[PDB]
């Protein structure tokens, strides 16, 4: 049950004032990446249509940080020898992974202001 | 017949101009409860959507107060031999329970100020 056109466009158009990070672009945001349960794909596909490439980029290394520390330290669910957590999150027998990565992304898209 | 992206986010579009306690936001918020049945999940969920943390908060706060007084005068169907009202109100074969809990939310809203 991945999300529809209809669904990104409102997303997008209710948060179109807001910048990145505010409390209405975060709480929007969560509300969309709690209730879809969403991969790392989907994710991905949804910052490209939201904002621009400059703030895919820095999205993109916060979050790499991030993932980096988390994964650094070691995690219940992920085990290195069978690919990146952008890759294990993929797999839909994997949820605390995917539930990981989406806490991660929406912590990284919070922290750019 | 969990809300999806459209219900909420018009619950919050027709809920933005208003201040919670005010009648506009109790009435919405008791129609969309009174017609969705919704569980402490989805609650939580709209909550969060809804107001900012602090009111979030806050309303926590009201809530811990009015489900503990609860429980020590007696619920008619809550047994504390398995989990909280708070996780007992997310079994579906408990209807008492989850209305009980939508009561309290509402009345926690409405006493804000």
Chains 1, 2 share one sequence.
């Not at 056109?5 to 709480?27: N, R």
């Not at 509300?31 to 490209?48: E, R």
């Not at 070691?74 to 999150?89: C, D, F, H, K, S």
């Amino acid at each position: 049950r991945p999300w529809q056109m209809k669904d990104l466009q409102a997303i997008k158009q209710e948060v179109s004032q807001a910048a990145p990070g505010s409390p209405q672009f975060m709480q929007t945001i969560r509300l969309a990446v709690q209730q879809f349960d969403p991969t790392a794909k989907d994710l991905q596909d949804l910052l490209q249509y939201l904002c621009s490439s400059l703030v895919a980029s820095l999205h993109h290394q916060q979050l790499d940080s991030l993932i980096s520390e988390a994964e650094t330290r070691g995690i219940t669910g992920y085990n290195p020898l069978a690919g990146p957590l952008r890759v294990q999150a993929n797999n839909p027998q994997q949820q605390g992974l995917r539930r990981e990565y989406q806490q991660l992304w929406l912590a990284a898209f919070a922290a750019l202001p």
